[PDB]
Design a protein around this ligand. Structure first.
Ligand SMILES: [Cl-]
Ligand SMILES: [Cl-]
Ligand SMILES: [Cl-]
Ligand SMILES: [Cl-]
Ligand SMILES: [Cl-]
Ligand code: NA
Lengths: 312, 312, 312, 312, 312
């Protein structure tokens, strides 16, 4: 959803402050009769303060909508506040305010950051610097790459010197949970920006082959691995191409990190490489469904080793 | 119930302070044997402080009474405090204290204000000024008219630039809930920001005809619309007439605002107009039960009437 | 779903007997690996008897399917038995068996018949003749029209000499409930095959206008009225045209009863008339969205009468 | 309610057989549009058999009515069957059928009889003769007086050679419970129709004065004592007088048994005596509220004896 | 129990400070092996501080004892603190220190004072002086008579200018509840220890005769009325005489206030009068069981007046 679904701008001095919507203001807006010309304008609930532009009605869950967010939960407020705190640190100017608020982001990523931030065990709880950096990355206001330290979060299920693997517990989210109960997804973030040894790569690949054999190892080009069911790959390709195409259109920074060819699923590496080369969706995407000549396996015997390890 | 059911006066210098009753003081009063001459006097429970005059026993729910209020709930205390705060701002004098305390008010309206006041999302939570105004209107100590901003509240089910429609949550009340489970009633308050446009009048009437076709649009003359089941119209008629009649008997001025003839149910407009002309209840109600086709042109003859006035 | 989802044929004498599937046989079939050539063949679970052809997998709810039926409920067995009892009375021959089982029917209609049949208050409980007739109508093996006596059932919400109105309680079904919690639908069946007086029509129309103003009065041409939300009409038109088109294709009896033009929604009568006249979907369907010149209202003042009735 | 609210007559051979209504038939009738002239006729639900005449609608509890009976409970069916069994033993004639069913009876009395007859400890369980007799008395088809053996029932709280005292547990009833939670009432039936010794009368009076001092001892003239709160006495006077008047008007002999003047409350004896003498309600009632000079009581110091027994 | 069951003395400066036992110190003491010589010495649990003298073991509930107090409840600690607060205000010296802790008091009376004290509605909550007075009276360290203001507490069930009647809720107590579920007792305290008008006495007697006719009105001579079941009177007599006899033998003054003969049960008045005259238990107590010549009824017709009030 757009950042504009959570907060509205308020001019103080030369700079804009951002304020969370009250959930009852949103609720009022959803029952409102509004002229077409005012669909893109902030809404006055009268009793509960300002509400988001009515054009965003479908971002919110109601009796007849389950494709939006549960804005009446406490997590909505927590996420809104997370966003506001980050935006407030930016000193957004008159010129940029609309651009900033129109950015569409992952709400689940933000709920996960709230979960990190509120846990006294977690570094984000103790470092406002890292919390802000992590949030800025999540709301499209940073050039920095998401790494282990700034990761959205979840449950750590594997870790070595170079990598941290997280289970994304989207089924249990309050604000915008995944509704398909068969959903399972992980991400692998890089611990440091530093050359990674063959040994540490091998360790990750061995874990992925043994423990997550039914998962494709892919990436959306933003600097981390996404571990997804093979049955979901086509959808990921659609999302990835569209984002890439759009960035080419708006001339926005369209840097796409392919990541390690020894780790990424062979077909996905082919699909994304062809995409970067400037091919159309159809040329790209069909590479996903093709059985390819198995590349020179950089790490033979990995699964057998894990197997023998388990037996002993 | 009378305001004297919630608090008692204490003279301090030149004006009164009002103090809420302890619920156990009321409970003791209910078991008390009192001289007839003392039925109208505030009661000393000895252990729990002053209590309301025994003449108001029937205002309180007991084993042999379910037609009063639940004075042992926390809401009783909250409503009593709301009343006291408003009354304390008035500087009530000896000349007026009896009249003030004898004013009968809607307890449900007051519970609804407590509900608004205690919600951080609601402007009443943040504006002592508006809270006082809203309360003063509710307890009959204001010249002001209830509007959206000063409304008793409830659930907003429709809103446009000119109007806010509220569902009244009376079934869920703690202090004096409606006990008939078939109860459904709404109210429409004017936002009163700017002059009203007929665009917004048409929108309201369309919502009412389409979504609430089984409800009569009426008013009790206090400046807002009441959306009631047609099957409850006769009862509202009786209540409205009694209040009107009583104000005539006593001497209080009857300000009955008829509102918009295009919005009010035609029969209700006729009934209230006849009432305002001093007709008996029997004559007024006949209009309620009469089949009646809408008035084409209520403004026809306005100039001719002015003409004949000049001739006279 | 197809009748073939509930039972399989077994040759006894010259005639076919029909036997319900065990739900664990179906469950086994859903986990089975089957050759393309055998998708249309009955499945042998080995342990739990015969199961339906694997081509019907999507008729059954599983972890990854919510668009089918809950075949593990007792209602599945009850419906299967209802079907078998009716089919067994037919003495289906070798030639017809495949045709009979391929018929797609409403499962909810059948669950409703089970609910009627199992209620000792209901005539279907006491008359095997009427139960069989009702079931045959429901499974496409009868020329008879569904009437009040043979109705699928539900809750009676209105009745007069000529009509019976039923609420379809699909939200509460066990086998294949409607999942959209906003669903509401009724049907009006004719009590007798006998001319209906203007008075009795007027009574129905008055009820529909007063109590169900937000519902379109339509029909699928099979001899009864369907009372559906206006917001669902376009979908009904799609379903109705497809069925009509298909029947023209297979040369199947394509009799479409328009029903009473004084009762049916004006636009729906236009749409279905144009359909019968042989027009395309686009010519037909667009009549639904057009505001038409209100036809000569056969019953003026109906809503006003009900209104005045309620007030008194 | 009238007997016609529970069953309808069906002519078999020589005479009428009474058959209980299905509760869904009643439920259908409540939704039915019926011609004015047919309001007093038995209603055909089509689906669920015959229903009571629509003129009796208010006898049945619905969403908008709480003053009737809960006809969807199993007790409705049990009461109906009890009525039917009694009526079917009478061989009612054509000339009598309508009057028999028009009789208004106590539904609570009937539920109590059901409670008696279904209890294997109770004599009514083991004697169809006594059961029929008890029921015929309750439904106004007997010249017999209700005694202990044929009592409606309840809980026995006192018993001696001559009397049995019952607590009427109307609060716990399923069909038509008393809704006032403050309700308490007892009845004292005579164990047999014989002269009662002074000693056995004195024993009853002693118990009433000691254990039930806040209760008036009255009678409705049907041969037993009713023990009711003094605060309900005036209401009993209204009901009793109303019934007495009704009988005199319709030429029915009241046969009002005053009962023992040594037991009945003095003011009640005066009231009913004045009623039998033919006086107006106003004149009779005036005797209820008259602090009349005590008659000397024929049982001195009964409470003193009980006190001393308690202390020992 | 003895005050020494709740606290121990600690000399501080000129006088003793009293300190509550930890419940685990008591629990330890209950398992302790102690010399007979030390049974009357305070016990050192080592772990949980000082404990009561082992001679008081039976005052505490354990697996083999249910006749004591529940010392592990929070009410134990509250009562203990209530006692200490009162004793500490006395500046007890070596002179009286031992007699103070030996005094046996009503634990239930003390729990009731805690219940009064902790209630913001109660005057004891706001006045430390009245709280101390009330407690000092309850623990036998005051010459003042218990009145309404200083009452132990309970539920107010009647009140007039002169009296307050309390229900003792001993069944619900935590520390040492009455275990006989048949228990019911009230007390009537004087609002002021001043002469009381005949009218105000009459009001009390009328309430007692009407609402509490099965209760004997007695007193234990300490300045208030106790309303007890007639079946408990003989036991009260034994307790009262034993205390009187004991006070005589222990030099302590009796000061038995017989209270008002127009209120007290005749037999109790005779018994206690005879007691005050120095007669033996046999002579005193037999007056309880004698049917006495009725005394001139001071207020004839009280019962009739209430009856008439109830009927109207
Ligand atoms: Cl990525
Ligand atoms: Cl109003
Ligand atoms: Cl149809
Ligand atoms: Cl009687
Ligand atoms: Cl005492
Ligand atoms: Na009828």
């Amino acid at each position: 959803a757009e950042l504009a679904c959570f907060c509205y701008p308020h001019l103080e001095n030369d700079s804009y402050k951002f304020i969370p919507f009250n959930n009852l203001a949103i609720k009022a807006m959803l029952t409102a009769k509004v002229d077409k010309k005012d669909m893109d304008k902030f809404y006055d609930s009268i009793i509960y303060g300002i509400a988001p532009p009515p054009q965003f009605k479908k971002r919110y869950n109601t009796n007849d909508n389950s494709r939006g967010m549960n804005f009446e939960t406490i997590m909505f407020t927590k996420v809104a506040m997370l966003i506001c705190e980050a935006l407030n640190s930016l000193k957004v100017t008159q010129a940029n305010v609309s651009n900033v608020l129109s950015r569409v982001v992952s709400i689940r990523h933000l709920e996960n950051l709230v979960i990190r931030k509120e846990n006294p065990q977690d570094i984000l709880f103790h470092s406002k610097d890292l919390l802000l950096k992590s949030t800025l990355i999540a709301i499209g206001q940073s050039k920095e790459i998401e790494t282990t330290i700034t990761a959205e979060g979840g449950e750590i299920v594997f870790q070595n010197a170079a990598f941290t693997m997280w289970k994304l517990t989207y089924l249990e989210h309050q604000l915008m949970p995944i509704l398909d109960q068969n959903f399972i997804e992980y991400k692998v973030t890089l611990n440091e920006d530093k050359p990674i040894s063959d040994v540490h790569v091998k360790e990750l690949v061995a874990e992925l082959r043994w423990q997550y054999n039914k998962f494709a190892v892919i990436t959306h080009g933003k600097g981390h691995y996404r571990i997804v069911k093979y049955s979901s790959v086509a959808n990921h390709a659609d999302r990835v191409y569209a984002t890439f195409k759009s960035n080419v259109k708006t001339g926005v920074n369209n840097d796409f990190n392919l990541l390690d060819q020894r780790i990424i699923w062979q077909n996905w590496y082919a699909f994304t490489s062809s995409m970067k080369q400037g091919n159309t969706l159809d040329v790209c995407k069909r590479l996903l469904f093709q059985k390819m000549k198995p590349e020179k396996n950089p790490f033979k015997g990995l699964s057998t080793d894990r197997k023998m390890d388990e037996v002993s």
